Copies of this chain bind each other. A is one copy, B any other.
């Protein structure tokens, strides 16, 4: 999986 988070 390509779990990407950007905050």
Contacts and interface: CB of A to CB of B under 8 A. Distances in A.
Interface of A: 1-7
A5 B2 contact: no
Copy tally for this chain in the complex stands at 30
A1 B2 CA distance: 6
A3 B1 CA distance: 7
A3 B6 contact: no
A5 B1 CA distance: 13
A4 B3 CA distance: 6
A4 B1 contact: no
A7 B1 CA distance: 9
A2 B4 CA distance: 8
A7 B7 contact: yes
